Design a protein around this ligand. Structure first.
Ligand SMILES: C[n+]1cn([C@@H]2O[C@H](COP(=O)(O)OP(=O)(O)OP(=O)(O)O)[C@@H](O)[C@H]2O)c2nc(N)[nH]c(=O)c21
Ligand SMILES: O=C(O)/C(Cc1ccccc1[N+](=O)[O-])=N/Nc1nc(-c2ccc(Cl)c(Cl)c2)cs1
Length: 185
């Protein structure tokens, strides 16, 4: 006898293929959804086993009903904690960071503040990979800084590695690199 183990939330995995030729929204595809521990690992292990990372090919895991874009009702007033990797952290750090990020989400690692979490995004870029946790209200200093503190600790980043929280509204009018931060941790 084998019972499945429900997650607190249902999650959706999205794929994105970079192409500045086409409008941004056109490059997004919903892969599948899951709401159990078993189904999470089945999907995670399948991607690790049968797929290869590719520059310009992003994955996003968001709560059911939240599209992984600024436009979404649940993201428009929100923002993200951004982790920027060096080019050499691609190997033997990116995979660890991403899985640890996924587990923060589905395990609701931020306690009552996990409610403010929308999802997470990994960008694979030759310029340097990026991982981010998106939250729903960029002005909720309490929730945002708590999520940031726990997230940084969970990833084991050295204290002198300062990570920043960007409002999506600011990002939309500049760039994730030149976008100034609302908070640091
Ligand atoms: C997350 N996101 C990104 N874009 C567009 O895609 C561009 C690249 O966004 P990016 O997140 O892929 O970062 P990248 O490393 O490619 O480059 P940089 O951040 O500019 O340094 C952005 O400049 C936006 O124009 C977006 N456009 C819309 N409409 N909605 C979104 O959520 C969104
Ligand atoms: O043109 C492409 O390169 C495409 C198609 C695409 C996709 C989105 C936007 C545009 C386009 N396009 O241009 O046609 N690649 N699609 C991919 N899917 C996976 C992929 C999905 C799901 C799981 Cl479970 C796994 Cl293991 C791999 C890896 S790559």
């Amino acid at each position: 006898h084998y019972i499945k183990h429900p997650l607190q939330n249902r999650w959706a995995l999205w794929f994105f293929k970079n192409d500045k030729s086409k409008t941004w929204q056109a490059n997004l595809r919903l892969i599948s959804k899951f709401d159990t521990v078993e189904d999470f690992w089945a999907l995670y292990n399948h991607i690790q086993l049968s797929s290869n990372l590719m520059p310009g090919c992003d994955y996003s895991l968001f709560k059911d009903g939240i599209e992984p874009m600024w436009e979404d009702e649940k993201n428009k007033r929100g923002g993200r904690w951004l982790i920027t990797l060096n080019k050499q952290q691609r190997r033997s750090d990116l995979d660890r960071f991403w899985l640890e990020t996924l587990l923060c989400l589905i395990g609701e690692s931020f306690d009552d503040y996990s409610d403010d979490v929308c999802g997470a995004v990994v960008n694979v870029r030759a310029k340097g990979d990026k991982i981010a946790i998106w939250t729903t209200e960029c002005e909720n200093r309490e929730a945002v800084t708590h999520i940031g503190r726990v997230y940084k600790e969970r990833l084991g980043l050295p204290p002198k590695i300062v990570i920043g929280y960007q409002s999506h509204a600011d990002t939309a009018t500049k760039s994730g690199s030149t976008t100034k931060n609302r908070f640091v941790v």
